[PDB]
Write a protein that binds this ligand. Sequence first.
Ligand code: HEM
Length: 214
Amino acid sequence: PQDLSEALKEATKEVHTQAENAEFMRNFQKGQVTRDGFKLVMASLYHIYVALEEEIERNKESPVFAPVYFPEELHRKAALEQDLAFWYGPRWQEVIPYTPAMQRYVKRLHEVGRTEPELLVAHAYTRYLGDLSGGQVLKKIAQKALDLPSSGEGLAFFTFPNIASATKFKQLYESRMNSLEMTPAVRQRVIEEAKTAFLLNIQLFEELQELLTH
Ligand code: HEM
């Protein structure tokens, strides 16, 4: 494939379907999701985005990332902080779980962000773009199966307020990725890192499913 974005999308088709097939994600799609299962996914997201956005801020000016740096449009941490306060309460920071599978994901993120900056774009792509184009469908489901009250909170994560049009921003971000110059070596590694990203989510889904079936 010519474009890195077109290359990524095609190289991760397999793992993505694999992601959709995961037991946890299947039940989620089959409208089957519990408050406890949803809390774990939000807790996970908070840990993942904290680490990811921590590393993006460290490589904000680097030529290997600057092109896809859109902090106001994409930051999710603040939104998740708001959400976890609703799901876990005022003391959420003390009680939210931080599991081994979440730590594995968080660890690879810090590693790439500290010793392989040129691969960070692979994680920002997988997370941000994935949650943006598939966000609505994923939220639509959850909010029905959750039948939560109407306190006006708990799902801020699924809404990117600083993005007027998801499609127009998607194409813009892709454009910026395709503008990134890299050796075929690096490019191949970025492609790999994206596949790796999907595997870190899949094993995470496996673990969460395990924790909820005792
Ligand atoms: C379990 C089922 C999931 C559903 C139902 C779902 C749904 C969606 C939808 C509706 C799209 C739109 C098609 C497109 O953008 O090309 C999409 C794209 C994508 N998803 Fe998923 N997704 C799931 C899980 C995940 C996971 C675990 C990740 C990884 C964090 C992920 C990463 C992506 C990426 C990166 C794209 C955009 C690729 C591109 O077009 O360049 N998705 N997803």
